[PDB]
Amino acid sequence: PHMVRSGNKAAVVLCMDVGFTMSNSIPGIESPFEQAKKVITMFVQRQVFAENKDEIALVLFGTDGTDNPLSGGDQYQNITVHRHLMLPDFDLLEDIESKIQPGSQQADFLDALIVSMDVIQHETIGKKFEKRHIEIFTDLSSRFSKSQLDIIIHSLKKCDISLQFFLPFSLGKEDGSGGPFRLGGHGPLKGITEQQKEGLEIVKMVMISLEGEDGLDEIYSFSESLRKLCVFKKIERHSIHWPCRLTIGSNLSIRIAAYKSILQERVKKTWTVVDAKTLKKEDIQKETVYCLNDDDETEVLKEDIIQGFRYGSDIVPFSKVDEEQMKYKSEGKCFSVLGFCKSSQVQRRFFMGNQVLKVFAARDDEAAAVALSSLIHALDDLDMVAIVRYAYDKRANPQVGVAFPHIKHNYECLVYVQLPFMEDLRQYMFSSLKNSKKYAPTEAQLNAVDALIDSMSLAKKDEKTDTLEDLFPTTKIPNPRFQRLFQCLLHRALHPREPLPPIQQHIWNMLNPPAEVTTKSQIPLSKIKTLFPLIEAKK
Amino acid sequence: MDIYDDKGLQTIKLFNNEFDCIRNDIRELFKHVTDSDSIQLPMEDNSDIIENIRKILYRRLKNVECVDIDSTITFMKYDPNDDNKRTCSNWVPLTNNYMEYCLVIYLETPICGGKIKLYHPTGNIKSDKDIMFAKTLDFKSKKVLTGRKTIAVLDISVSYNRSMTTIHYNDDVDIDIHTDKNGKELCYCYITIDDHYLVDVETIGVIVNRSGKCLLVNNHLGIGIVKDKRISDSFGDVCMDTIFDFSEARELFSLTNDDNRNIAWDTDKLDDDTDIWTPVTEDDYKFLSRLVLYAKSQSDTVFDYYVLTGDTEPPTVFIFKVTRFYFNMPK
Amino acid sequence: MDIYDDKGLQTIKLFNNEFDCIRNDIRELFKHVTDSDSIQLPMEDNSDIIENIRKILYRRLKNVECVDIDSTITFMKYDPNDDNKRTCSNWVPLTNNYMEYCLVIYLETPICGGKIKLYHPTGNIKSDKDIMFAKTLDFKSKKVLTGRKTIAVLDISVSYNRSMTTIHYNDDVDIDIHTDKNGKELCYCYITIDDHYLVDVETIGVIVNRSGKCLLVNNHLGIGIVKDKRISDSFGDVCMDTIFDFSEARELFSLTNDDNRNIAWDTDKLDDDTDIWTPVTEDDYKFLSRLVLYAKSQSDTVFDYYVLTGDTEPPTVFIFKVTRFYFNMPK
Amino acid sequence: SGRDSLIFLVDASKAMFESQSEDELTPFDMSIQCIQSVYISKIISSDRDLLAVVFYGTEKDKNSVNFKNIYVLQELDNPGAKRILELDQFKGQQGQKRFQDMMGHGSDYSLSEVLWVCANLFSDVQFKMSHKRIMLFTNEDNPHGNDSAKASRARTKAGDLRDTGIFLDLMHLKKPGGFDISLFYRDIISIAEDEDLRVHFEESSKLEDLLRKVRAKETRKRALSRLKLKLNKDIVISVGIYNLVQKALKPPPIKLYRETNEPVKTKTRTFNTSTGGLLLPSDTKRSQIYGSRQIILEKEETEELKRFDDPGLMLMGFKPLVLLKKHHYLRPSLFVYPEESLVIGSSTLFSALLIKCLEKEVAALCRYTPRRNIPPYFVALVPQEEELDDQKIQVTPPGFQLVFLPFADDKRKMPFTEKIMATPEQVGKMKAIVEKLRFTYRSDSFENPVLQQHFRNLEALALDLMEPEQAVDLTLPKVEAMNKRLGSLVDEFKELVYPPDY
């Protein structure tokens, strides 16, 4: 399966502080300038190497010069527009890498927001954009005015402009504070100054006004930004729906739209084999030869081989077959309920396919929404799932799958996952381990394993709330292959005479559990090592 | 010179260097004349030259299906004292793509006068060469004034390819259906949509004028939908409002052809916005039903491929099998 | 009435009622003339009439690729006292699909006489209606007995498409390229494929015989690829071998047409394989180069769509732009 | 090695034709249908195994060395259409009559002679020798109870056959009064460890359970890989990874030379155009075009940019099972079992981990790298306890379920939707409809229609017959049955839910 999207682009303005305070050092943490550079580089790398149509502008504030269209003398000073709205390229990446330098001045970030708004308003008149976004990378360590505030908000609601904020610190509450410092890992309210607190209050007020309580979820830190897909959250697009009718019998039909919820992301481009010197594909010929079953080197024509099928110990030639004969004439695209069954009967290990579908009611259909809600709630109440037949179109091979209810506070739907046929099941037999005298663990070994499992827990219960918190959610972590590939490609494009750089530290940090688990597990691991003999075979 | 009428059917054919390889044999056949004003010789015995002229006509005529020559040659001698029209050259073909011709091959050509004259109320033809003319035209053998004019006459029946059809509109007037566009104002397209996961309609039918406006006539349930009189500005609008089961298709993508082609007029120039023809009288509905039936009959043998593209990422492609018929309408 | 020459070009055209909605406008335009028997306006007045004439010529002609109309419009009035023959100073065109014409629309038709006479070796045409004749021909305006005769003259240049062309095989015999399958055996196909996520080869040239055998000619690397003599039994396997040379795509799927349509023919049956044509001489390579050059020259405006289906999960559809030419190789 | 050898031994005694119910499958028909199903499964799976069918207890004999009451119907060869048809000749009452006419159905036999004939069948094959096994279909638990001399010889011959290397499995069918294995067998059948002492199958009564038992004891388990599970850099155990589910694809056509029909190799070569010749692997480079910019990498660098960790499984921690979502499915799961042949002591640690993970209801979150130079994926090892049905068939193997977890890039955005709730009356009507259409789901309840149609066409062609009769798809809902069951509830649900205008 592949993702098909609408075809709408977005305009994104990156507002970056380059002021004096965004250069301070500390023995163990990078300066906020470098972290903002890393986040911006990651965003632009993904935009460039995926060949998207989104247009990106870059506005620096805190610079030593002034190149903004609102200067007018003694106003909006030290704000430069380093790049206007256009498709990103390698020149922008080189500029981010080794052309943009820290400044020696300070600028109000609300004036920078005004300049970014002006860029969005006056540079999108001739073009079409479905989303307008501003990402602000600041540290909130400069004096600011509050006069224009209200006007700002009004504009942000008149022109429909979204905002995201990135800061050197997080927005956690009662975090409790806590070897070497690691960036990008999963694991400081007293470390900020009063001006930072005032800036944080104003940022919170703007975010609450624009969106609400959920707006507080759109304030991130650079460290957590490097290990999430948050910078792409407001410019992502969903797939084109699959329209059909859920049929229970031949008299009940519900108009439904299906969307792809899970689908593996793959590299879009491959590597082309080219000549060493000319660096062109035309200097390479790939010809296949069917050299019989020996080295006779007999000339073979393309029509000499007639092809055929195998049915065990016999061969049915292609000359005795017809295209119309072996063709399963499908009845068409369908979504039909074969039956309802207990949820315990359908197990997870039998899930098949390479996609998960979410089924909603058809857009602008109140009756369909009511009917689908009734079906979902009945299934949830009775603890049952619908075994259904699924056909993508009149050419796709029909499959049998399971649809189960999915109720949330903001939406409700069905979830479709494929199920196996008889031919896909392998009936192996394995020896029982619990009933084995040869491999029966002792009590001490069981105690050691219990201690190991206790010390390596990745969850924590909330304080008298019965809520489980995940200390290592891997589902929010991006695939490291894409960032590593982008880094290597950019390094090759900008440093042709250099070897590929090593893997960045923050990728390793985000691929590893918190250091607390590793610290806790050291002693039970030693006990397990001293209790379980493990000798390699000497064949 | 291929003389073509308004119906595309050849009427007059003049040859100069085409029968020079046959005249000697034809004269050798001619000597068996003994005091006959207009002699007739059956060619059931000497049918070789019949085959030779058949081969020549097959080679030098366009869009030929069958040539049925008659096995009789009529030799006529013309003297300085003669004047003939027969004044009764009226004859209506029974079918559409078939025609009977008279073939005159000159044996002894007059040196000065007495050519053959062919009449038609848009121009007149006078010729003194090997001629082949339909039986629907009045002809004159002009009064020769010197020598003698000895000619040979064959009878020819030719059936061409079926590029012409007739449909009855009312008692008085009928309508002509043509496979190709030439001075035709209206085009009917019978469309079968290839299987796509977004398309919920199999077959449709539209009428398009040169302005590009489209009127839906049939949706595989008959011609009932033409009663609603749904008119769209183009074919993309017809697809947007007809073949998609969801609510707002225009919000998801836009349909266009990447080669600037039209479903009916190909790479032509659409006119400015004009009124679109719609059926008002029961005769119009009967004609529309007949046209839809005929188009459905031929939809499995003749059709072409049309492609529409939706600006998705990746782009979506819709494939249509189109059967087109071009026609005119009375004022 | 349509008149064509041996090469296939159109030389004369006779209009019955085509110029009727413009005669009143031209008459109104000729009210603004004071004492001028022959007067030329290099203004066109309102260009609406020029656009109307351009559209009429576009619609009621064949294979028109472009139309150019001079701005000057001449008007000529004839008296029963003066008339003479005007030859054309042997105007010869340069390119073989282009001709300049003279168009005459009658503002006042004489009661007697006043007929345009065109001279050609095959015959002479005498007409009394609106006409359009090539500037190559020689013409005369006959004397008027009763009444007056006022006509309008415009200069129009049009370009055509040359449905049939010629390729010089040698110094003695040159063969003819036809756009229709009727009577032809060998078919050259120039195939292009649009953007796709599984296609890496764009252009392929394939020669197909009536038995379905296909031979590669060009794949944008030149014509020398015909030296390997890659002969296959279907276009799908040719596409798999050449256009789908990817390692993952080798043992992946197969290509087929759901409508049982071939590239060379639509529904004609395939005869049993007997032999496959192959260039054995030296001038055959020049032949192939000329054919490829002509096909590439005309590939930006003349093409049709072809559809193939690949059995993947889900199955995919591939669209090809094809330019087809038909010919018979003399033996 | 590579070709497994399996011999189907079917008893031809009288009691195999007794059916205790007028509408029931006789044991002989059960055995024939099971063998036919095994043949069909082997052909569909394209498994190159050797199968033989031998009848003992008949009145006619066809064995090589002249022995009485032993008929070798089919020797060792690959499955085919003609053998399947010949087996089909014996199915049903007419098939029973045909078999009782071609052979006998009552005689005196010696198990020693039968096993000797089967051993000679094993010896006659010269292609490959690996995994020889004899499956006995019978419902007589005391074959030589009145002849101790024959019983001792049978025990001795079974012992020597077992020392040679041939496995002996029993497929005992239903008997009046129960089947007692301890009476005469347990001295012949192969027993390894304790899996054949207390975990032995029960007597078969139907076709489905007998088929499952036959396929369970004949299919050798093949491991995709033998990775290393590393609790840390020092404690490393050896495990095997299996695919208990795998999509069945329609076999692609093969290329055969015109001279007879022979498989032909498909070689690939690289030519440098005019110069020609086998281009060296170090004479090529890899390129990528972005806009108008070309990026050039060597093949080694292309492999290096994909390299994160060494192959194996690296433990990251332990997570509660409630934190794993069913709608986060990415790709089919795998199965993890201990492997004692590589690291000694792996089974004990594996068992301890399984027991404790089942007790505490935790899954092991690990990092997974299958091969060299492959980016990692986060996986969850979910503990899985052993489950047996009433027939003592292992429906669930003990071990770990390797569940693939999605990355952030594999999760797609959903469009905004307004939550529309349904009144309790509509939900109740829907509950009534749902209950009226309740059925039991089994993992082996549906068959792929395209595969079945393809192989039916192939079988019809290989037998030189015409196109086969189409069969009704079993994955298509029975609309009429559902409509009759639902009755009027659909109309009332539509009245409550669907407005009259639309």
Side-chain angles (χ1 to χ4, degrees), chain B residues 17-196:
Chain B
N17 42 332
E18 291 304 314
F19 296 76
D20 44 272
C21 323
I22 286 196
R23 223 182 325 259
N24 237 0
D25 264 340
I26 278 273
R27 311 216 216 216
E28 296 302 320
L29 278 165
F30 160 72
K31 39 200 193 202
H32 321 321
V33 154
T34 41
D35 285 342
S36 294
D37 298 340
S38 172
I39 193 138
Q40 203 166 2
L41 297 175
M43 315 311 297
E44 289 180 352
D45 297 344
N46 292 336
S47 274
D48 183 0
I49 46 62
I50 311 275
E51 193 23 48
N52 281 67
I53 294 111
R54 152 146 31 221
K55 230 180 288 191
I56 295 186
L57 290 183
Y58 269 98
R59 285 182 188 171
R60 285 260 48 78
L61 283 195
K62 315 182 56 43
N63 310 53
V64 194
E65 158 188 339
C66 166
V67 179
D68 177 42
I69 317 194
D70 207 277
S71 61
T72 183
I73 296 333
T74 317
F75 300 79
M76 314 166 92
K77 285 184 176 181
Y78 279 115
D79 282 350
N81 284 344
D82 80 291
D83 257 326
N84 277 329
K85 295 191 191 178
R86 294 176 182 170
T87 204
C88 288
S89 188
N90 77 62
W91 181 91
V92 175
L94 305 175
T95 71
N96 280 320
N97 323 58
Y98 145 88
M99 189 44 115
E100 321 206 320
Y101 302 89
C102 174
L103 181 58
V104 169
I105 316 200
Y106 272 94
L107 288 212
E108 231 48 63
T109 83
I111 53 157
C112 279
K115 302 163 84 158
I116 280 183
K117 188 156 198 114
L118 295 168
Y119 300 133
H120 202 269
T122 166
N124 294 299
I125 303 301
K126 275 213 307 197
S127 186
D128 56 343
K129 303 248 191 291
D130 307 299
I131 216 77
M132 170 165 61
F133 59 95
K135 276 195 180 11
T136 62
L137 324 191
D138 259 305
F139 63 101
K140 184 52 131 183
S141 274
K142 283 272 290 295
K143 202 196 97 160
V144 307
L145 44 56
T146 186
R148 274 155 212 193
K149 182 225 196 171
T150 85
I151 77 173
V153 158
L154 281 73
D155 230 330
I156 288 266
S157 283
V158 181
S159 82
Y160 299 81
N161 284 356
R162 290 201 279 163
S163 43
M164 181 55 187
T165 315
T166 322
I167 291 186
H168 291 114
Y169 185 71
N170 54 10
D171 294 347
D172 163 79
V173 77
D174 55 342
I175 273 151
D176 310 344
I177 269 46
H178 265 111
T179 49
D180 43 41
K181 47 155 161 181
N182 256 352
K184 290 315 189 152
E185 335 190 3
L186 282 178
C187 174
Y188 170 78
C189 319
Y190 190 87
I191 298 139
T192 319
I193 304 136
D194 215 12
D195 196 76
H196 206 272

Side-chain angles (χ1 to χ4, degrees), chain A residues 5 229 238 250-251 253 260-265 269 271-274 276 279 282-283 285 287-290 292-293 303-305 307-308 311 313 318 325-326 328 331 337-338 340-341 345 348-349 352-353 356 366 373-375 381-382 389 408-409 412 419 422-427 429-432 439 446 450 454 456 458 470 472 475 477-479 481 484 489 492-493 500 508 511 525 533-535 537, chain D residues 79 195 215 219 221 232 235 244-248 253-258 263 265 267 269-273 283 285-290 293-294 296 301-302 305-306 308-309 318-319 325 329 337 340-342 344-345 347 356 360 367 377 386 394-396 403 407-414 419-420 422 426 430-431 435 437-439 441 443-444 446 452 457 459 461 473 475-477 482-483 494 498:
Chain A
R5 297 169 173 100
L229 283 186
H238 60 271
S250 160
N251 294 310
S253 212
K260 307 222 165 34
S261 151
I262 306 268
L263 193 62
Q264 182 143 0
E265 188 88 70
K269 288 208 183 235
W271 295 96
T272 286
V273 187
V274 301
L279 293 178
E282 278 81 27
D283 314 288
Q285 288 181 335
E287 286 184 350
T288 175
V289 305
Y290 318 109
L292 309 103
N293 247 15
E303 303 183 3
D304 165 69
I305 306 160
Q307 271 222 120
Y311 192 80
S313 45
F318 255 47
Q325 156 192 117
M326 315 138 304
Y328 175 79
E331 327 82 274
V337 172
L338 300 165
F340 299 97
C341 81
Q345 292 182 10
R348 189 209 226 289
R349 63 199 173 110
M352 297 250 300
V356 167
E366 218 276 302
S373 206
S374 288
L375 180 64
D381 287 334
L382 281 180
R389 182 190 143 114
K408 268 172 161 5
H409 63 290
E412 52 186 14
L419 282 185
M422 252 202 58
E423 291 86 340
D424 318 298
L425 299 166
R426 319 217 167 176
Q427 34 264 49
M429 224 152 179
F430 297 83
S431 306
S432 208
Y439 312 131
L446 292 165
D450 194 291
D454 267 351
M456 269 179 102
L458 301 177
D470 204 329
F472 194 25
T475 310
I477 296 175
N479 200 335
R481 63 165 330 146
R484 170 77 171 150
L489 289 181
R492 186 47 94 236
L500 291 184
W508 275 132
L511 290 179
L525 279 172
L534 293 170
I535 313 128
Chain D
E195 329 294 317
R215 308 276 302 126
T219 36
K221 42 205 215 62
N232 75 66
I235 305 129
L244 302 189
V245 307
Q246 183 74 260
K247 201 207 151 161
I254 72 197
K255 292 159 188 176
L256 56 100
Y257 205 75
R258 259 174 193 161
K265 303 174 185 178
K267 297 171 181 178
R269 289 183 176 179
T270 51
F271 285 92
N272 199 89
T273 66
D283 211 45
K285 297 223 184 187
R286 305 303 186 263
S287 151
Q288 246 164 2
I289 282 285
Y290 286 93
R293 202 123 170 176
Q294 205 194 39
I296 291 296
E301 293 195 290
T302 295
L305 59 87
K306 284 205 261 58
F308 275 84
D309 293 294
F318 291 94
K319 223 180 242 187
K325 303 307 177 13
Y329 164 76
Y337 198 73
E340 271 278 16
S341 47
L342 278 63
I344 286 131
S347 278
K356 282 318 186 170
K360 294 172 142 17
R367 231 148 72 208
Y377 250 95
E386 172 178 52
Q394 190 173 84
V395 317
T396 307
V403 185
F407 275 117
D409 314 276
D410 308 326
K411 275 154 73 91
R412 312 299 169 150
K413 181 172 171 288
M414 288 306 114
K419 203 156 135 86
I420 279 182
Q426 296 155 327
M430 192 67 275
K431 264 177 224 194
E435 282 293 298
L437 271 157
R438 158 210 287 281
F439 89 118
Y441 174 71
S443 176
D444 63 359
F446 302 103
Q452 298 289 108
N457 301 348
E459 165 164 335
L461 278 190
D473 192 8
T475 76
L476 259 177
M482 305 173 90
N483 292 339
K494 289 221 255 184
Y498 280 167

Side-chain angles (χ1 to χ4, degrees), chain A residues 142-160:
Chain A
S142 299
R143 312 183 73 146
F144 74 57
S145 83
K146 276 204 289 214
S147 50
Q148 320 246 33
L149 203 32
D150 319 306
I151 304 301
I152 279 162
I153 296 183
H154 190 259
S155 291
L156 293 175
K157 305 218 229 221
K158 208 165 90 33
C159 324
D160 204 27

Side-chain angles (χ1 to χ4, degrees), chain B residues 1-6 11 13-14 16 62-64 117 120-129 161 180-184 194 210 257-259 261 267-272 300-307 314 317 319 321, chain C residues 1-6 11-12 14-16 51 55 58-64 115 120-129 137 178 180 182 194 197 257-261 266-267 301-307 317 319 321:
Chain B
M1 289 220 151
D2 282 343
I3 293 318
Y4 289 146
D5 53 14
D6 86 87
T11 303
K13 186 52 173 172
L14 54 95
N16 39 326
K62 315 182 56 43
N63 310 53
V64 194
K117 188 156 198 114
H120 202 269
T122 166
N124 294 299
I125 303 301
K126 275 213 307 197
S127 186
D128 56 343
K129 303 248 191 291
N161 284 356
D180 43 41
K181 47 155 161 181
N182 256 352
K184 290 315 189 152
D194 215 12
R210 289 261 189 189
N257 198 259
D258 289 345
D259 314 295
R261 290 186 156 201
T267 36
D268 274 35
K269 258 290 282 303
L270 328 167
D271 306 359
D272 310 313
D300 36 23
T301 60
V302 317
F303 73 92
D304 52 306
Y305 282 134
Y306 194 52
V307 161
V317 183
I319 302 122
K321 305 162 211 42
Chain C
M1 273 315 227
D2 288 344
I3 286 151
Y4 291 69
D5 90 9
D6 288 345
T11 303
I12 317 184
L14 267 61
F15 297 94
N16 283 270
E51 217 64 32
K55 254 182 281 183
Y58 253 105
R59 280 189 221 314
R60 330 274 305 248
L61 289 173
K62 280 184 133 142
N63 320 114
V64 166
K115 289 201 205 195
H120 189 267
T122 66
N124 298 340
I125 319 289
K126 215 162 51 183
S127 46
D128 61 341
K129 312 258 219 263
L137 310 188
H178 302 217
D180 41 336
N182 197 24
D194 317 305
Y197 54 90
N257 186 255
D258 286 82
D259 292 297
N260 310 29
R261 257 165 97 102
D266 302 351
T267 53
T301 183
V302 167
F303 83 84
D304 53 344
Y305 289 117
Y306 195 69
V307 159
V317 178
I319 320 278
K321 298 161 140 210

Side-chain angles (χ1 to χ4, degrees), chain B residues 284-312:
Chain B
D284 307 295
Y285 291 106
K286 272 136 101 197
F287 173 80
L288 249 61
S289 184
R290 277 138 173 180
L291 184 56
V292 165
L293 248 172
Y294 185 54
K296 189 167 147 344
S297 85
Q298 316 236 320
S299 50
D300 36 23
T301 60
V302 317
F303 73 92
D304 52 306
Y305 282 134
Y306 194 52
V307 161
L308 253 59
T309 307
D311 52 294
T312 57

Side-chain angles (χ1 to χ4, degrees), chain D residues 60-344:
Chain D
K60 278 192 212 36
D61 42 358
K62 209 231 179 173
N63 48 44
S64 68
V65 65
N66 220 16
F67 278 161
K68 294 189 174 182
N69 322 103
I70 298 169
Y71 199 87
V72 177
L73 182 75
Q74 312 194 340
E75 264 161 71
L76 270 80
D77 204 65
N78 272 34
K82 270 119 174 35
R83 309 204 141 194
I84 289 194
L85 196 46
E86 171 156 30
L87 276 174
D88 220 291
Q89 275 330 279
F90 295 144
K91 167 194 169 73
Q93 292 278 314
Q94 292 172 337
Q96 154 179 0
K97 286 297 301 300
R98 206 159 327 139
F99 172 85
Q100 265 167 152
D101 294 340
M102 191 145 78
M103 270 142 268
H105 77 287
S107 287
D108 253 25
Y109 50 92
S110 309
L111 264 283
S112 39
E113 294 212 358
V114 187
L115 298 167
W116 196 352
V117 163
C118 295
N120 274 343
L121 271 162
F122 281 123
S123 87
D124 279 350
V125 161
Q126 288 179 335
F127 204 80
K128 286 292 179 183
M129 338 275 294
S130 151
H131 272 348
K132 309 134 89 138
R133 50 190 333 119
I134 309 176
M135 296 204 347
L136 197 40
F137 293 81
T138 193
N139 69 340
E140 175 78 7
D141 42 323
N142 229 357
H144 297 331
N146 312 6
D147 216 289
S148 61
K150 272 204 240 211
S152 79
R153 276 174 259 202
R155 299 167 156 113
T156 311
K157 287 302 175 185
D160 308 29
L161 260 67
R162 253 143 60 227
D163 321 304
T164 279
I166 307 142
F167 304 134
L168 263 156
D169 315 293
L170 188 70
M171 292 286 124
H172 55 292
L173 312 162
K174 191 170 121 259
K175 220 190 80 172
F179 195 103
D180 227 305
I181 270 176
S182 55
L183 227 38
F184 173 85
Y185 297 107
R186 270 176 188 177
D187 323 319
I188 294 177
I189 71 157
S190 291
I191 292 165
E193 293 178 351
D194 52 275
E195 329 294 317
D196 304 74
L197 289 169
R198 297 179 187 171
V199 185
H200 203 286
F201 295 134
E202 302 281 81
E203 52 190 305
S204 286
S205 286
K206 302 190 226 123
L207 188 56
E208 41 266 30
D209 45 349
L210 177 59
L211 200 31
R212 299 227 300 289
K213 295 179 204 165
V214 159
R215 308 276 302 126
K217 237 175 194 170
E218 80 102 357
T219 36
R220 183 225 302 131
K221 42 205 215 62
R222 293 180 185 173
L224 273 44
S225 35
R226 306 181 178 177
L227 295 179
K228 317 200 278 265
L229 214 168
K230 323 192 199 74
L231 299 201
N232 75 66
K233 221 140 216 172
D234 303 87
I235 305 129
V236 183
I237 70 164
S238 63
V239 298
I241 312 275
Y242 304 79
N243 37 16
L244 302 189
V245 307
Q246 183 74 260
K247 201 207 151 161
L249 320 153
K250 158 189 320 194
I254 72 197
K255 292 159 188 176
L256 56 100
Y257 205 75
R258 259 174 193 161
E259 289 186 350
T260 71
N261 313 314
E262 282 147 54
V264 186
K265 303 174 185 178
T266 58
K267 297 171 181 178
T268 53
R269 289 183 176 179
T270 51
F271 285 92
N272 199 89
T273 66
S274 41
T275 62
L278 295 178
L279 214 55
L280 300 173
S282 82
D283 211 45
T284 36
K285 297 223 184 187
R286 305 303 186 263
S287 151
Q288 246 164 2
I289 282 285
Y290 286 93
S292 64
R293 202 123 170 176
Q294 205 194 39
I295 296 137
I296 291 296
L297 257 68
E298 303 231 4
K299 192 183 176 182
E300 30 257 58
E301 293 195 290
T302 295
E303 270 338 302
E304 192 170 9
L305 59 87
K306 284 205 261 58
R307 172 178 108 69
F308 275 84
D309 293 294
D310 288 334
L313 281 155
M314 272 183 333
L315 182 71
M316 311 275 88
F318 291 94
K319 223 180 242 187
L321 282 174
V322 289
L323 290 182
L324 295 200
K325 303 307 177 13
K326 216 169 46 199
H327 59 290
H328 277 2
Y329 164 76
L330 176 64
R331 86 168 287 291
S333 320
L334 300 177
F335 185 69
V336 182
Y337 198 73
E339 213 140 31
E340 271 278 16
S341 47
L342 278 63
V343 182
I344 286 131

Side-chain angles (χ1 to χ4, degrees), chain A residues 18 31 106 171 226 233 246 264 310 390 394 453 458:
Chain A
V18 293
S31 52
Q106 294 262 70
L171 210 71
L226 283 176
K233 200 198 311 205
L246 183 134
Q264 182 143 0
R310 173 100 74 176
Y390 173 81
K394 219 178 290 304
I453 291 183
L458 301 177

